[PDB]
């Protein structure tokens, strides 16, 4: 029941910024993920507990990377791939990042189990890496895409086909944004924070050199994860709050936060291409 | 045969952004390059194959770094060094980056020869590091500066002397931009990409620990190289395309791409100061 103002964005800057970031991410992710997949699955033919997690993470990152050219084309020019490809691209994009973040949490939990009390950790670790991982990471990721699989379709306006997500009301958008941010940030973030601290608290009892290596590594991992993800989720959260009509600063702030969300969503994709460097320490 | 629009740029932001980036690069590059030159050439007095490549790369980076104060002064205030110094600075700037990128490619090729088949690699490696490297990296770099050595001169306008590159027509500018991007990006990039992948494909046959170190290192190198160079060359390529009158979005896009090229050219100089950190793993 208020005056609508439509979004205005820096299209000229986006048309140059999105393709180059997408190209960098595509090249680096293809290289790293293909190399690690070739190293782990194709040649070893005998995998340990951590190798399965690495392979799952690499598969998720490659699945995310595959859809990047479609996003680049959409950013540069009109959508030219049809409704079915729009749905498939959206589904893959939603699945891949959820899978990657849940694999991050699962790797953290496996390290917790393996490091603190390893005397009786054989059976739980084996069961977690064999059976629980599937129903933990892949099934919920597939289930959460039903709204994406249903409500995503291409719209015809003038000449420009629009591959966008259409929701019948703002409530649907809000509920889905809150669920996305809640899961993705809160759950793995809390798991990692309550995990690594206890791990290195227990390490310092009798080991003198592994403790400093772990202190350096966990801080690196936490810094990278948070610097990659926090601004995007902060933008989404404040956008949801202003969509709930509890934040009223006008709507120039709304255009500013929309630009912030777009730029940070473009930037946050570096996680997929940067994961293979971070998690090359698993076997030691 | 169209309406000309002149470039408009954020001079106020540039006057603060260029000096600080140039100062950071100058300090870091002087420190690192002087230290590595002192370590390698002045004290060792007996060099291996990789040490010669390191010394060449350091010399190229130092040559690039030397000219930075002139660029900083030009960005801040008027040109006050004369025509001959303008020509010399342009020649050194053109030579140094070409030399550095070709040395990158040559180091990659030397690693390819040394790692995959080292049983019969003695003579080719020795010949490549002794004779071929000169005519490979230094001679073409000097030859490519003839247009720079000829067409670069200072122009007098009002009071402001302008140290710029003057070409009699747009075709000369286009041909030279295409040659620059083609060589610098396509050749070493393809060499490195087709090199490191095969290297670590061959490593995994019988070695278990060197493979993960190489997988981490090559991905680091590729990510750094591409993140440093791709946006600048993308800006140059799209500027050439819009100069060829095959891209017509107005010319606000032209001002935006000119600003993007300026900022990315300022940012891409971090390669010279960041090389000594990346390539400290050569001897192992």
């Amino acid at each position, epitope marked *: *029941m*208020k*005056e*609508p103002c*439509f*979004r*205005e964005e820096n*299209a*000229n800057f986006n048309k140059i910024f999105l393709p180059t970031i997408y190209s960098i991410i595509f090249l680096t992710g293809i290289v790293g993920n293909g190399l690690v997949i070739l190293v782990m699955g194709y040649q070893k033919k005998l995998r340990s507990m951590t190798d399965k997690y690495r392979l799952h993470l690499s598969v998720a990152d490659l699945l995310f990377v595959i859809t990047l050219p479609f996003w680049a084309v959409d950013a540069v020019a009109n959508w030219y791939f049809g409704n079915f490809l729009c749905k498939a691209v959206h589904v893959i994009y939603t699945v891949s990042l959820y899978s990657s973040v849940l694999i991050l949490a699962f790797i953290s939990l496996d390290r917790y189990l393996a490091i603190v009390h390893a005397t009786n950790s054989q059976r739980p670790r084996k069961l977690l890496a064999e059976k629980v991982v599937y129903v933990g990471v892949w099934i919920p990721a597939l289930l959460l895409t039903i709204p994406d699989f249903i409500f995503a379709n291409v*719209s015809e*306006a*003038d*000449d*420009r086909y*629009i591959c*966008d*997500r*259409f*929701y*019948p*009301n*703002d409530l649907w*958008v809000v509920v889905f944004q809150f669920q996305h941010i809640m899961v993705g940030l809160i759950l793995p973030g809390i798991v990692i924070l309550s995990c690594y601290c206890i791990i290195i608290s227990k390490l310092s009892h009798s080991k003198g050199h592994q403790k400093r290596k772990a202190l350096k590594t966990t801080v690196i991992l936490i810094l990278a994860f948070f610097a990659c993800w926090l601004p995007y989720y902060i933008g989404i959260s404040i956008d949801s709050f202003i969509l709930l009509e509890i934040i009223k600063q006008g709507c120039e702030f709304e255009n500013t936060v929309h630009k912030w969300i777009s730029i940070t969503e473009a930037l946050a994709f570096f996680h997929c291409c940067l994961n293979p460097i971070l998690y090359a320490f698993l076997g030691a | 045969m169209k309406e000309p629009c002149f470039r408009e740029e954020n001079a106020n932001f540039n006057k603060i952004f260029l000096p600080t980036i140039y100062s950071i690069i100058f300090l870091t590059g002087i420190v690192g390059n002087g230290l590595v030159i002192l370590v390698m050439g002045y004290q060792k007095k007996l060099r291996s194959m990789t040490d010669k490549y390191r010394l060449h790369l350091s010399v190229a980076d130092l040559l690039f770094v030397i000219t930075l104060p002139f660029w900083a002064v030009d960005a801040v205030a008027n040109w006050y060094f004369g025509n001959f110094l303008c020509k010399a600075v342009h020649v050194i700037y053109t030579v140094s980056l070409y030399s550095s990128v070709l040395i990158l490619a040559f180091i990659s090729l030397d690693r390819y020869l040394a790692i995959v088949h080292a049983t019969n690699s003695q003579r080719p490696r020795k010949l490549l590091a002794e004779k071929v490297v000169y005519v490979g990296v230094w001679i073409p770099a000097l030859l490519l500066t003839i247009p720079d050595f000829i067409f670069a001169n200072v122009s007098e306008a009002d009071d402001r002397y302008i140290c710029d590159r003057f070409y009699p027509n747009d075709l000369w500018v286009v041909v030279f931009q295409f040659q620059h991007i083609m060589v610098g990006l396509i050749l070493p990039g393809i060499v490195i990409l087709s090199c490191y992948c095969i290297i670590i494909s061959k490593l995994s046959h019988s070695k278990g620990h060197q493979k993960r170190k190489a997988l981490k290192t090559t991905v680091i190198l590729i990510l750094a190289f591409f993140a440093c160079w791709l946006p600048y060359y993308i800006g140059i390529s799209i500027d050439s395309f819009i100069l060829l009158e095959i891209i017509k*979005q*107005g010319c*606000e*896009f032209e001002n935006t791409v000119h600003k993007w090229i300026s900022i990315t050219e300022a940012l891409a100089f971090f390669h010279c100061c960041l090389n000594p950190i990346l390539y400290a793993f050569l001897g192992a």
Partner: antibody
Amino acid sequence: QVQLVQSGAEVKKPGASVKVSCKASGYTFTSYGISWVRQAPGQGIEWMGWISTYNGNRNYAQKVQGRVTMTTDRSTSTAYMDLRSLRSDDTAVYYCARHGITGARNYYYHYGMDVWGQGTTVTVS
Amino acid sequence: DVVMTQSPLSLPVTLGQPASISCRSSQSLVYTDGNTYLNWFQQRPGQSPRRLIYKVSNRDSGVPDRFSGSGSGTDFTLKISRVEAEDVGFYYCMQNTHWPLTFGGGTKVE
């Protein structure tokens, strides 16, 4: 195919209120806004207002603001426009036109003006 | 806000030769991205207005080749290369770049 159907012609006394209905069929009703426009006899087509039919942020024109309301219905996929303070010059032909595009990530307003309704005429005496 | 005038107000034309109608806006109808939005509507009597060309110089599917538009900046026009007996009706030019939208004055073809 996509189409918009309006109601029948109406005659009303001055000072009364009128309700005009616009049923849209053939496409997703919750992805495009609806603009109501008026054509007077012997006068150019003049805009009055627009309703987004998705978050319901209606917007008016100063010539008509303060005497008109717009209300949508997703279940019936219909748009209603109520006009009060009826005057002598309000006799004209009202059209219901699809205007703008609304989505989660695309909320512009320069993509539309494609399909028009059959148009309903109202007179006063 | 933007005000337009159409020229000429009345253009009687004999069947068999092309005709032109020109309208100019109060200000430049160029959006931030460098694109321009201006469309031309034809209304036959008793019918709802029909969208001939949507973006300037670009026509929809399903109309003859006779209609074609051209223009830029502030000045836009539509030319019919051949007048047919079924091309009689009112013509308007409207812009959708600024809020709110504005229609044209209206041109009658006889």
